Amino acid sequence: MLDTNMKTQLKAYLEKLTKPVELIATLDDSAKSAEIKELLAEIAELSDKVTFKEDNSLPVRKPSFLITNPGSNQGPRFAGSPLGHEFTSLVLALLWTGGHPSKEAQSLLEQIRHIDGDFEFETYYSLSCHNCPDVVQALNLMSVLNPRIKHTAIDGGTFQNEITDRNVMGVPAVFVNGKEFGQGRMTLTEIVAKIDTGAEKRAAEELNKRDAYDVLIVGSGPAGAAAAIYSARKGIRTGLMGERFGGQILDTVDIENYISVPKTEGQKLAGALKVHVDEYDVDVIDSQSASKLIPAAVEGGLHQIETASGAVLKARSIIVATGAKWRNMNVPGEDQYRTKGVTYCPHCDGPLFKGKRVAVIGGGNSGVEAAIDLAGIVEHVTLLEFAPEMKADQVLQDKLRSLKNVDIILNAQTTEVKGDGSKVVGLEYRDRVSGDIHNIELAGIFVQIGLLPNTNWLEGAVERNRMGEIIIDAKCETNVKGVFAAGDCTTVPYKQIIIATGEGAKASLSAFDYLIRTKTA
Amino acid sequence: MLDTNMKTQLKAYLEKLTKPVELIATLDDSAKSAEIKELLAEIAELSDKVTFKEDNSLPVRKPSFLITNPGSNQGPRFAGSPLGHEFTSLVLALLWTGGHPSKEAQSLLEQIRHIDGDFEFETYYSLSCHNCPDVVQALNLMSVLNPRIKHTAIDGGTFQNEITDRNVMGVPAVFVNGKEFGQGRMTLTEIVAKIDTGAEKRAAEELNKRDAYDVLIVGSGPAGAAAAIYSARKGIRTGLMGERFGGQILDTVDIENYISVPKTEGQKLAGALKVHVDEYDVDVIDSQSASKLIPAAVEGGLHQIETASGAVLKARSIIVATGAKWRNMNVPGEDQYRTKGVTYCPHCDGPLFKGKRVAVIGGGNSGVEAAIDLAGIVEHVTLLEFAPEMKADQVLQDKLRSLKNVDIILNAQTTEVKGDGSKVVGLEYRDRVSGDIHNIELAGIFVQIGLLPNTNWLEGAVERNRMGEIIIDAKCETNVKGVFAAGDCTTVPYKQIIIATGEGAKASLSAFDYLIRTKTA
Ligand SMILES: Cc1cc2nc3c(=O)[nH]c(=O)nc-3n(C[C@H](O)[C@H](O)[C@H](O)COP(=O)(O)OP(=O)(O)OC[C@H]3O[C@@H](n4cnc5c(N)ncnc54)[C@H](O)[C@@H]3O)c2cc1C
Ligand SMILES: Cc1cc2nc3c(=O)[nH]c(=O)nc-3n(C[C@H](O)[C@H](O)[C@H](O)COP(=O)(O)OP(=O)(O)OC[C@H]3O[C@@H](n4cnc5c(N)ncnc54)[C@H](O)[C@@H]3O)c2cc1C
Ligand SMILES: NC(=O)c1ccc[n+]([C@@H]2O[C@H](COP(=O)([O-])OP(=O)(O)OC[C@H]3O[C@@H](n4cnc5c(N)ncnc54)[C@H](O)[C@@H]3O)[C@@H](O)[C@H]2O)c1
């Protein structure tokens, strides 16, 4: 039923065929199926690539024909007339199946080439309908790429029997596996979204496709936030990846040394940090953990960060700001009284305990200094050391034995934090030697047993001191060109919010200075 | 007229005499003056120190007698009876004048021993009055110490003539140089305040008397404020001296990078800094300039700071935080448009000039980097260099010549900042070679010609790099034990409020650590 106009175009279009096409028909003696025999044999006669065969004992509609390459039995199936408005749908099916490429976004085409679900699409059309080809062609494309996605386009003029049995007022009308899909306009892009609803949001593929960063900051505590703002203000492409925006301050409650702010709160300062950040062009990535730094193999090239989610980001410059974790005792009641008397930092919370009795857990330098600190502010201090002797510098140990409101207890293992449901009221411990249990009444417990920088993921790539801290010069420079670090994760002598924010800003200005110096062409 | 009780005490009290006393009388034949002859000769007869002479041609009241040491004619003069309630006033005058000491605050006594004004005090009393001795004795004491302060105590029973001529309803009643002074109760302490109303508030003597500080912080910008809060929170004795509380931020207007605070203002942040400070025990000294550090000559001893006012303060530890001054062009209109388009820092203000044309003044590193910075943010940048070539690292000069929105002008001396009464609209300059005048239209002028740390007052005492910055390690330690430094005055690579506050806190924690380590007895 091809008109001469269609023939000439079709002859011209089949000249753009690089693979051999076969049309496999299933026909039933009716004059409609005779009309489709004629057509297939007309088309076959127009090209040496195109062969018309027929197999009339297949479990598919009659009349219909599979378009395919030799051997393989995968491709678009038309039932009834592939003419009218669907003429250009038919040329396209032959072309694609014969090696011509899709004229649309190849990213989607790969996405489609990899899909797991088994889908038969059967679209219902009729020859008169103007808006039906775009849906037909769409789902045609799909059937060629992935062999799991089958597609039968159905002319309503030939199957009024199926039009009624299954209600179809209005075409086009598609039916994914004997189930209503959708009607009217649908672009391929739009089709593929809905089909992969039970998709799997590969946000790691989102991340892998991003452009290189001018600076990528790893860690979104105070240090990294501060660095993100200073970087964004220079207008450079800036990224800020971290596990949890706000770092340590988020789990903090009463904060009284953020300079200029007599009293604030962790959740609030963290929100204030997020607001300042969003005042600038900063791609904030949350809930994402860095697992490896790969240093650029040449100056002027790019460093890489690997995430635990399997993504890889790329940056002209990196800033590490991943902080530290204070070690816990891991005893009953420790959790329960976190921020209600059990604390870590003596700098931050010391003043809250004037007049009160406290304990320091840990006999290292950090614990011993902490006790000499608290001793001046508070009424009584009890230091408890797990080992049979204190580890701290002698100078400090003698100074602590000099004060009149302090007790040292050796071989003392804290077993329980006690409180009243609201606040700490005491401590239980055992003598690791005789096994004897003991009780202290107090209002505060300062755990000073070790800081652990979050840097074991950097082993081998940047240099660390012997406590795990990232070694930095005054400019926050690491031993790798174009990698800087700021905050508690580094060798800064002290760990405070106000100190960490200053270092992030430094690291940012140092990173910018390195970008502008990276030479020329 | 001495009764036997008075004699016995007086005999006992004159035994406490270390110098020779002379009573010089002026007497007029009346039986009152005969009554004072008798008395003087009774007293003379009670001690070998006390001699009674009389000179009856002196320009003073009759009867009266000067009490004094031989030769010299200075001391308390009584007119009429020095008896009744004023008996014990008389013993005291003889004792003090004969070398016995004042039983009251010797600080005041030195203050009084040094006074410049010429004062005759004449107090009016009468024998019956209970509250008159304390005023009489007070002003007696004064007359012995300083020889400029004369004092005649006047018995009203003998001079009813002067009681009426000069109205005196109610005693005691004192008259500094023929002029009403005061009536009723007056302590010496209270007398001396009022007499030195035209005193001179030696606030430097206030400062010289203060106890040693645990830490003395020099400079009350952000760095020193931050250090004062961290120090005070440890409860140590802390002092914060500076020229002007708030440092550089006070003259600053729009501040958009104080981390956590999207927009604040200089005068406000400075007030917020003052409030946080006053939340703790910090002796704030304002309007006071340090002129010299004298390092302790031994560990465990005290450093000293000399002020321009001549005061000297003492501290176990010092923190220097005296900042820097950006160099000005010193041209007409520079002042006028300070904070209205003329600025110093490109980090702070760069973002305000998106789309705008700007100039950078200065072809050093700081200027050239600044131009490469602004070039990315802004539409056009014009760098003007006073010399015939730029000074900056070559790397940077080539990078600046690489950009497409930049002009370099050599031998260019800015002559005028132009505006519209509100904001900068352009710049005038001369070619230092041909002398030709030129004009540029712009909205911003970034002056980048040199930072000058405020540290020339430290020459020789602590070590400085070659740009004048105080050399510090990561711990803010200087090359002198127990002296630390923080903020723009030091070698920190960048000068920002958030960076300076972090350094002040560091320097504080480092200073505290040094205090606790300073050994033992
Ligand atoms: C209970 C408590 C109370 C405190 N109170 C005060 C106080 O009153 N005042 C004060 O000044 N300081 C206080 N501090 C300390 C203060 O919070 C720290 O100085 C500050 O948070 C350090 O900031 P930071 O940016 O360097 O690191 P962090 O705050 O620890 O933030 C680093 C961030 O990076 C994340 N991260 C870690 N590893 C990775 C990775 N591989 N990839 C991506 N992200 C990663 C971390 O989970 C965190 O979110 C307190 C700390 C605690 C624990
Ligand atoms: C116009 C302008 C705008 C700025 N805008 C910003 C901005 O938007 N953001 C930002 O982060 N930074 C900004 N800055 C810079 C910021 O103010 C500095 O980083 C910061 O003030 C440095 O603090 P500081 O404590 O180290 O020293 P300073 O702020 O300079 O304070 C030191 C103090 O010590 C005093 N002093 C000096 N000598 C002595 C002495 N011998 N004895 C006693 N006291 C002494 C000084 O007069 C001053 O009061 C700006 C600076 C200027 C000039
Ligand atoms: N300046 C800082 O803020 C900072 C912070 C952390 C570490 N550091 C430095 O790192 C080094 C490590 O010193 P440190 O004191 O942090 O660690 P440390 O390992 O040297 O001392 C830890 C001590 O805790 C004791 N201990 C452990 N578990 C205990 C428990 N459950 N109960 C009681 N006692 C227990 C151990 O016996 C040991 O004495 C030092 O050089 C220190 O100066 C510095």
Ligand SMILES: NC(=O)c1ccc[n+]([C@@H]2O[C@H](COP(=O)([O-])OP(=O)(O)OC[C@H]3O[C@@H](n4cnc5c(N)ncnc54)[C@H](O)[C@@H]3O)[C@@H](O)[C@H]2O)c1
């Ligand atoms: N990182 C920082 O924030 C910081 C701040 C200040 C200085 N520095 C360092 O100190 C050194 C000094 O560099 P710098 O650039 O501050 O100073 P510089 O003296 O090296 O350069 C100053 C330049 O200004 C030019 N100049 C002076 N007056 C001028 C005028 N009125 N008009 C036009 N041009 C004029 C001079 O010709 C000279 O080229 C460098 O090593 C720099 O890195 C660093």
